[PDB]
From a paper:
In addition to tau filaments, we also observed singlets and doublets of transmembrane protein 106B (TMEM106B) filaments (fold I) in the frontal cortex from cases 1 and 2, and TMEM106B singlets (fold I) in the spinal cord from case 2. Senile plaques have been described in around 60% of cases of Guam ALS/PDC and assembly of Aβ is believed to be part of the disease process. Alternatively, these changes may be age-related. This was probably also the reason for the presence of TMEM106B filaments in two cases from Guam and one case from the Kii peninsula.
pmcAmyotrophic lateral sclerosis/parkinsonism-dementia complex (ALS/PDC or lytico-bodig) is a fatal disease found in the Chamorro population of Guam (1–4), some families on the Kii peninsula of Japan, and the Auyu and Jakai people of New Guinea. Abundant filamentous amyloid inclusions that are made of all six brain tau isoforms are characteristic of ALS/PDC. We now show that tau filaments from Guam and Kii ALS/PDC adopt the CTE fold in brain and spinal cord. The greater heterogeneity of amyloid filaments, when compared to CTE and SSPE, probably reflects the fact that ALS/PDC is a multiple proteinopathy based on neuropathology, as suggested for cases from the Kii peninsula.
Residue numbers in the entry:
A (entry chain D), B (entry chain B), C (entry chain A), D (entry chain C): 120 to 254
Write the structure that this text describes.
């Protein structure tokens, strides 16, 4: 990666930005830029590359063979009861969240039993997150 | 990746942006830019590449063979009861969320039993997220 | 990827944007740009590439063989009862959400039992997300 | 990908945009642009490419063989009862959502038992999402 960046408000190369109650007067701004960029990125020079896989099974006796991959979930219970009994009563609820198994972002890449891989793999996340606001 | 960026409000190369209660007066802005960019990115020079797979099964006796891939979910229970009993009562609910198994973004890539792979793989997420707002 | 970007409000190369209660007066803006861009991206020079697969089964005896792929879901229960009993009572509900299994974006790519792959694979998500607003 | 971007409000190359209660007076804006762009993208120079698949089955005895692909769903139950009993009572509901299995965007690509693939594959999502608003 090159130049992965989180900027909260503002980006510039060059900035003369003015705000609020300003007297900006008799100004000379003179700017001579020479900004050149040369990226040579993820450049391969390969003569041979081989990804060979071979499985021989002879005069074998295989039995009861179980290959289970990743992220197996079995026998999982969420029990979240709510009861509200009221006699002769005043209830006031505001901004009340029951949240179960609540995801924002899920990135999965190369999630396997077997993997042969050759090259570049990349995950980038950039974010402002706010779960709850209440005034 | 090159130049992956999260900017909250504003981006410029060059900015003379003015705001609010300003007197901007007798100004000379002079700007000479030479900004050149040269990207050579993900450039392959390959003579040979081979992805060979071979499976031989001889005079074998295979039995009860189970290959289960990733993200298997089995026997999963969400029990979320709500009961509201009221006698002679005043209830006031505002901004009340029961959220079960609530996803925003799911990216899946190369999610497998077996994978042979040659090259570039990439996931990028950029976001403002806000789950709840209530005033 | 090159130049993947989330800008919250505004982008410019060059900006002289003015706002609100401004006196912008006797201004000389002079701008000489030379901005050139040269992309050489995902460029392949390959003489040979082979994706060979071979499966031989000899004088074999295969029995009870089960290959299950990814994201298998079995025996899953969502029990979300709501009961509201009221005698002699005043109920007031506002902005009440029961959300079960609520997705925004699902991207799936190369989700398999077996995969041979050669090249570039990519997922990009960019978004403003807001689940609930209520004033 | 090149130049994948989310801009919340406005984009320009060059901007002199003015707003609100402005006196914009005696202005000279002079702009000399030379902005050239050269894209060489996803360019293949391949002499040979082969995608060979071969399946031989000899004097074999295959029995009870089950290949199940991805995203199998079996025995899934959503039980979401609502009961509202009222005697001698005042109910007021506003902005009440029961949402079950509610999707926005689903992109699926190369979702398979077997796949041989050669080249570029891509998914891009860009969006403003708002589930609920109520004032």
């Amino acid at each position: 990666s090159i130049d992965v960046k989180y900027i909260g408000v503002k980006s510039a190369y060059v900035s003369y930005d003015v705000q609020k109650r300003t007297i900006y007067l008799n100004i000379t701004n003179t700017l001579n830029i020479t900004n050149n960029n040369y990226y040579s990125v993820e450049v391969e020079n390969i003569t041979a590359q081989v990804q060979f896989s071979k499985t021989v099974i002879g005069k074998a006796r295989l039995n009861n063979i179980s290959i289970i991959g990743p992220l197996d979930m079995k026998q999982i219970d969420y029990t979240v009861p709510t009861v509200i009994a009221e006699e002769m009563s005043y209830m006031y609820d505001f901004c009340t969240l029951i949240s179960i198994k609540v995801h924002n972002i899920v990135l999965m890449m190369q999630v396997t039993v077997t993997t042969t891989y050759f090259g570049h793999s990349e995950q980038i996340s950039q974010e402002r997150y706010q779960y709850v606001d209440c005034g």
